[PDB]
Amino acid sequence: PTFYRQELNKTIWEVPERYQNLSPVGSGAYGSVCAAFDTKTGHRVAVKKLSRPFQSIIHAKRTYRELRLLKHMKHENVIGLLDVFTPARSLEEFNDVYLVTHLMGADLNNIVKCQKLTDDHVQFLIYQILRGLKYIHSADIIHRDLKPSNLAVNEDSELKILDFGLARHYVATRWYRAPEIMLNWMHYNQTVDIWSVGCIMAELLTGRTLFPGTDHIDQLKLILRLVGTPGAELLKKISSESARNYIQSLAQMPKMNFANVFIGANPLAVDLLEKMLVLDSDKRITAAQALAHAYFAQYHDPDDEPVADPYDQSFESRDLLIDEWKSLTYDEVISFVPPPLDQEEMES
Ligand SMILES: Nc1nccc(-c2c(-c3ccc(F)cc3)ncn2C2CCNCC2)n1
Ligand SMILES: N[C@]12C[C@H]3C[C@H](C[C@H](C3)C1)C2
Ligand SMILES: [Ca+2]
Ligand SMILES: [Ca+2]
Ligand SMILES: [Ca+2]
Ligand SMILES: [Ca+2]
Numbered sequence: 484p485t486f487y488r489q490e491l492n493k494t495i496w497e498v499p500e501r502y503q504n505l506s507p508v509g510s511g512a513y514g515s516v517c518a519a520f521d522t523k524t525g526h527r528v529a530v531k532k533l534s535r536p537f538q539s540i541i542h543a544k545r546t547y548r549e550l551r552l553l554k555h556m557k558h559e560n561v562i563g564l565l566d567v568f569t570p571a572r573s574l575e576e577f578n579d580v581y582l583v584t585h586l587m588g589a590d591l592n593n594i595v596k597c598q599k600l601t602d603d604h605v606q607f608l609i610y611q612i613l614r615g616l617k618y619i620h621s622a623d624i625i626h627r628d629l630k631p632s633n634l635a636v637n638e639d640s641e642l643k644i645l646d647f648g649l650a651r652h653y654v655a656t657r658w659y660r661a662p663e664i665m666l667n668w669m670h671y672n673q674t675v676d677i678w679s680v681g682c683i684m685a686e687l688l689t690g691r692t693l694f695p696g697t698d699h700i701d702q703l704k705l706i707l708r709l710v711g712t713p714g715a716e717l718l719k720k721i722s723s724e725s726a727r728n729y730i731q732s733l734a735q736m737p738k739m740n741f742a743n744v745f746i747g748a749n750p751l752a753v754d755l756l757e758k759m760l761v762l763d764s765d766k767r768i769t770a771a772q773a774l775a776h777a778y779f780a781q782y783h784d785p786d787d788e789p790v791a792d793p794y795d796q797s798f799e800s801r802d803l804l805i806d807e808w809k810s811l812t813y814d815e816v817i818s819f820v821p822p823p824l825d826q827e828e829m830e831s
Pocket of ligand 3: 784788830
């Protein structure tokens, strides 16, 4: 393919002539993104140029991790890959990676901000998050920082999870993070992401942020006002003695009845929130359990809530040299097989 160069976000992008009319639509994890027109299929796409993908061992492994993850993700509510390209003619020239997915014009903050959402619409939005989570969780992938700005939404409210499974080694909002993550507790499971869904769903229903804490301690106090003081068993999870002593010394608070917090909400929504917003991560509902909850009865379809193929994450434990990660990434670029344009069939 013939490539062309265009300065976007103050830097030169080099892309195949197939992709036209690039215009910036914001930053993503470790890269910046442009919307484009795919002249091969007439579809609108989003193209992410990774920033400094091989500058250090941290960047190089992050680049491999992201390409491996995105090549594996094949679910209608999870960002996946239509294409991956590099202007490099060989590994020796290889220093830039571009990832291509379907264009999603908005994030969840664009949906709720200026819109009084109906309950049926909230159901659809949360249903899609949970369907995507069941899939990624089934591959032993956790998001860990799920929030409205990590949920891409298109013009018809179709939603995809992105920026999951990233980070190993800019000020982000922590309002949606699971307490065990925000506070660095010693163990956690996939249901960290279900806490985040609870926080998102609460805000879609009320129009107000659930736990808008000014710092870690203020946020914890807001959380405890809703869910009540935890038992000594929860302290088991917290390494820092100072943190445990602080929590233990707080004046005891009762759990609130969520029916008195989400006044006027669908009682089924309140019940689901009660099951998601639990401090005990072993008591928190899973994504697959939540999809069966009566709140989603008009959307639930077991035939269309798939799990993922096994995902080999053995590379995560390995320390390799920059050029090894780079060569592995080049291999993944070259071996990528674009999916069919139409991968779906009418149901039954
Ligand atoms: N508009 C849009 N549409 C789809 C995805 C993205 C996208 C990607 C991304 C990931 C992989 C890929 F291959 C291509 C793009 N990373 C961050 N974003 C965000 C850019 C602005 N915030 C919401 C989405 N942006
Ligand atoms: N957002 C809220 C924070 C705190 C807990 C609960 C009820 C009140 C006090 C408002 C949610
Ligand atoms: Ca169906
Ligand atoms: Ca079809
Ligand atoms: Ca479609
Ligand atoms: Ca069916």
